[PDB]
Structure 1
Amino acid sequence: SHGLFKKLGIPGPTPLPFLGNILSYHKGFCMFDMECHKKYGKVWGFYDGQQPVLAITDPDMIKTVLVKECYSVFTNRRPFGPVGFMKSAISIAEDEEWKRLRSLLSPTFTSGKLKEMVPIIAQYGDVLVRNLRREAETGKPVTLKDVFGAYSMDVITSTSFGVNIDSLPFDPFFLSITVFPFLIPILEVLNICVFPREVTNFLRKSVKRFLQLMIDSQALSDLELVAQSIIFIFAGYETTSSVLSFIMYELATHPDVQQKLQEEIDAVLPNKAPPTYDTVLQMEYLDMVVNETLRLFPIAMRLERVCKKDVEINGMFIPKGVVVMIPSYALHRDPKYWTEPEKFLPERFSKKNKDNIDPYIYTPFGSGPRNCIGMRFALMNMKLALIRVLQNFSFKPCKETQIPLKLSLGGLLQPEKPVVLKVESR
């Protein structure tokens, strides 16, 4: 099984027995792909344990896989286990089960359903400013992800089910998953779960204890309703808090961008006006700061699809079973598309330059029928948070602020040291 890429004439690092190329993950996925992209070029291959993975970087080939041939050949991502009842989760479900869920949960983030959330989300931002107003009178550094995640958790529990909460689950084992994918069926029969069975049991009843748009379209079951809640509750918590952490870091280390951002926020919203739906989509420099940070830090790093039958896309044969992977972190930093790629420059996304950008190289939300379902909510949730917070505070680095910011070497685009900055009240 380790000769598939030598057979196909597809270059790539030489795998070791059993381990495949997993030892190269010692610098993390990101550094690995970046090197691989430089070592072999437009297409290479490797082996996650015994699993052959093909990395494509051709925008037409990517558009073919993510969009053109999704419903037919590349419907599902890499199998993930032990999952248990979470197999029915939309990010985990496959084939006709997924198509049903993706239709049943699509009308949750329509342009109208989000517009009803702006008056509701506008409460915890004041809880966020007032929670930030207490640790700023105190002249001390601040952990952003804590106060952001506390904010983000307030939003996710209320935008889906609605609960007024003032928020003042969760290399190690998965290392054995990839060399022992034959052990995943073992763990599924032991009720073993990558999600600890006390975190889910806390919710296998708490959900019985978006929510409205599920039973109303019930068709849909009940234990699957809990599993979708878990996906959303994580997605809205971690992703929103993590990217907001990255954004406030970049604003602090690039102060000119921060002021020019505060100037537009007070122009569209004078006298510190409440951000409404229509004023959020008007702030284009806000959008430029958001996109550029997502370029440097696509939390997902990679987009993956399982080839489910033999194909010959764009002149290249791809055999059945190969996991097709798009190195998103690698593409977002390729000098063959980005001038001075490591530098933070939101002017890449101005309406003067936003057209020299291939939407199949910059894919922080995926593409095609399987892209991020809550893309429009996450942009709206973050922008309402950046408006309300940059309307009241400025952000400076501290002595303990990590500069340059080191990325983690795990499986999530997280910083090594938590992001701490000084906050000052305008």
Structure 2
Amino acid sequence: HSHGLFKKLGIPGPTPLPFLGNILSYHKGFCMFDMECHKKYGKVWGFYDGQQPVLAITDPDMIKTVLVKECYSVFTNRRPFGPVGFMKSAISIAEDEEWKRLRSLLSPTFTSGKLKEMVPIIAQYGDVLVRNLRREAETGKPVTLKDVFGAYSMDVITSTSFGVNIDSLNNPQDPFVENTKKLLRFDFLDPFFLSITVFPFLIPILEVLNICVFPREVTNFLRKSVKRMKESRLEDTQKHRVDFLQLMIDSQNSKALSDLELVAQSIIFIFAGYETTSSVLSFIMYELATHPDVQQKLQEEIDAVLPNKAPPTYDTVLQMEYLDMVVNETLRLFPIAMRLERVCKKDVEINGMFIPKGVVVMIPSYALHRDPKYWTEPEKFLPERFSKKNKDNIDPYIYTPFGSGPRNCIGMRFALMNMKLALIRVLQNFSFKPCKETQIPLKLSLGGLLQPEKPVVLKVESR
């Protein structure tokens, strides 16, 4: 029984139960579990996900070692998370040289030049969003911001990546949004995902049964969508710009990117660009609404840089320090990650401490983001933390909302800009106010993914 390993290495931790490990402790959300474990254990601890030994680490240097120094040699892959099917070839799930080949190929997608060619493309979509909101602005009833941001983010990602205008904004009952949000119902009171975290030995078996954590009732829709919208649809080059679709087409003809492998990456992009982007935007608006001085101070920058509702540009976006601070701050309090993780591929002693092969190393981002060692009054939302005159007191290995090292978020620059353009255009025309149903203080979901327990509703007013 691999359960005696952490006591056998002198590493502290909560007592494992047979078979379950410590999974019962996720009863109050694992973020809480992490915070407790930090308070009580220190720099370093160990616990079990079923039989799977995880090792939490909090030392900055040790974190840098793992994420950056030894990524290529030792800590190269994340943990396998369940029965995955064809999606084994998605970049974020892919391991070692198959991942590195995919990384190398998709790296060029998000260069400042490729990015600045999206500035005008999104610009046209920000106009549609503005208009959508003005419609509810005129009505004056609570908005579920994920709905409006969702379709926005979907329209943005679909056009930037493939060239296709699916027009999600002008479509409430939209198949592309409706299918994509059903993709991961991750939940521990959901008897399925619990059981593969506990019992991952059933994984090999479910693969052979073509069972995915992804409803095939989704992946088939997305498979058919991308199927010939790559093929007979994009043909005569025609208006062909910077689209990752082509970058995967262009590097198929004259190494070698398969067809199902192509669909697989697209799904990663569609999901990231929809769910992640829209969740964060919803989190910032909640903060800006529960903090009006912050919302105003921002609206002032927005007009100070773009004189009286002027159209945003690449260079214009980067200039705005306070807008970057507001985004960074929300991401401090609401990390979509909530844990960074790497599988130990061979044996190592990192900075005077030994990790055996097969162990999962886990950085508890959520916890470290709220640690009194690094953060003054870490509970409070304080954008001023990220000002030019305070960001040196910030440790680059305690604050990583995008991960770090060679496996960090490939989408960082895209999402930052995409989110900011959305914000600018929105605050440039509207102000946001608390509602009667607005969950204050907002509690997070007890289960898996970082989401509100109650969906975010707020009042919208034009200026």
TM-score (norm 1): 0.99
Deviations 1:2-22 (A, max 9, x none): 000000000000011100000
Select between 171-180 and 98-107 the one with higher mean Cα deviation.
171-180
1:152-206 C-alpha deviation (Å, 9 max, x unpaired): 01101001002223325x9441101022211000000000111011111112222
Rounded Cα–Cα distance in structure 1 between residues aligned with 2:297 and 2:125: 25
**Range moving further from structure 2, 214-223 or 102-111:** 214-223
Q: Please, which moves more after superposition, 54-63 or 154-163?
A: 154-163
Render the CA deviation track for 1:199-235: whole Å, top value 9, x for unaligned: 1111222212210111112221111000000000000
CA contact (8 A) 1:127 1:166 kept: no
RMSD: 1.1
User: 216-225 vs 375-384, which deviates more?
Assistant: 216-225
Distance in 1 separating the partners of 2:192 and 2:104 = 34
Quick check: 1:28–1:410 contact (8 Å CA) kept in 2?
yes
1:271, distance to aligned residue in structure 2 (A)? 2.2
> Which runs of at least 4 in structure 1 moved beyond 3 Å after TM superposition?
none
1:47-102 deviations in whole A, cap 9, x for unaligned? Answer: 00110000000000000000000000000000122111100000000010000000
Q: CA 1:172 to 1:379, structure 2 compared with 1: closer, same or farther past 3 Å?
A: farther
Instruction: Measure the CA separation in 2 of the matches of 1:165 and 1:270.
Output: 32
In the TM superposition, what is the alpha-carbon distance from 1:123 to its structure 2 partner?
1.3
Deviations 1:297-343 (A, max 9, x none): 00110100000111000000000000000000000000011000010
Could you say which residue in structure 1 is the equivalent of 2:89? Answer: 88
Percent identity between the two aligned chains: 100
Shift of the 117–96 alpha-carbon distance from structure 1 to 2, 3 Å rule, reads: same
Deviation, structure 1 residue 410: 1.5
Structure 1: distance between partners of 2:63 and 2:73: 15
Whether the aligned pair in 1 keeps the contact of 2:81 and 2:197 (CA below 8 Å) is no
Q: Is the 8 A contact 2:81 2:196 kept in 1?
A: no
Matched length: 425
Q: CA deviation at 1:129?
A: 0.7
Shift of residue 39, structure 1, vs aligned partner: 1.1
Give the TM-score, by structure 2 length.
0.91
With 203-212 and 72-81 compared, the bigger mean Cα shift is at 203-212
For 1:146 and 1:116, the matched residues in 2 are separated by: 27
* Residues 395 and 424 in structure 1, CA contact (< 8 A), matched pair in contact too: yes
Deviations 1:373-393 (A, max 9, x none): 100100000000000000000
Give the match's secondary structure for 2:311.
coil
Could you list the per-position Cα deviations for residues 94-141 of structure 1 after superposition, in whole angstroms to 9, with x for gaps in the alignment?
010000000000000011110100100111111111110001111211
Compared CA separation, residues 64 and 171, structure 1 to 2 (3 A): farther
Whole-Å separation in 2 of the counterparts to 1:100 and 1:166: 33
CA contact (8 A) 1:45 1:53 kept: yes
Q: Structure 2: which 5+ runs fail to align? A: 170-188, 229-243
CA distance in 1 between counterparts of 2:449 and 2:307 reads: 38
Determine if contact 1:56/1:326 at 8 Å carries over to the other structure.
Answer: yes
Cα separation, partners in 2 of 1:172 and 1:283, compared to 1, 3 Å: farther
Tell me the CA shift for residue 402 of structure 1. Answer: 0.6
Distance 2:340 2:110 in 1: 22
- Residue 384 of structure 1: aligned partner: 421
**What are the superposed Cα offsets for residues 258-288 of structure 1, whole Å, 9 maximum, x if unpaired?**
0000000001101211110000000100000
Question: Match for residue 215 of structure 1?
Answer: 249
- What SS does structure 2 have at the residue aligned with 1:379? helix
Q: Which residue of 2 aligns with 1:242?
A: 279
CA distance in 2, matches of 1:384, 1:88: 32
**Contact 1:171–1:411 (Cα < 8 Å) also in 2:** no
In 2: Cα distance, 1:144 partner to 1:103 partner: 35
Distance across 2 between alignment mates of 1:64 and 1:73:
10
For 1:341-392, what per-residue CA distance to the aligned partner results, in whole angstroms no more than 9, with x for missing partners? 0101000000000111001000100000000010010000000000000000
Structure 1 match to 2:27: 26
User: How far apart are the structure 2 equivalents of 1:37 and 1:76?
Assistant: 24
| Structure 1: tracts of 5 or more residues without a match | none
Separation of aligned partners in 2, 1:158 and 1:149: 14
Q: Could you tell me whether the CA contact under 8 Å between 1:140 and 1:422 is conserved in 2? A: yes
Q: What is the rounded CA distance, in whole Å, between the counterparts of 2:204 and 2:164 in structure 1?
A: 38
Query: Match of 1:371?
Result: 408
2:312 corresponds to 1:311: no
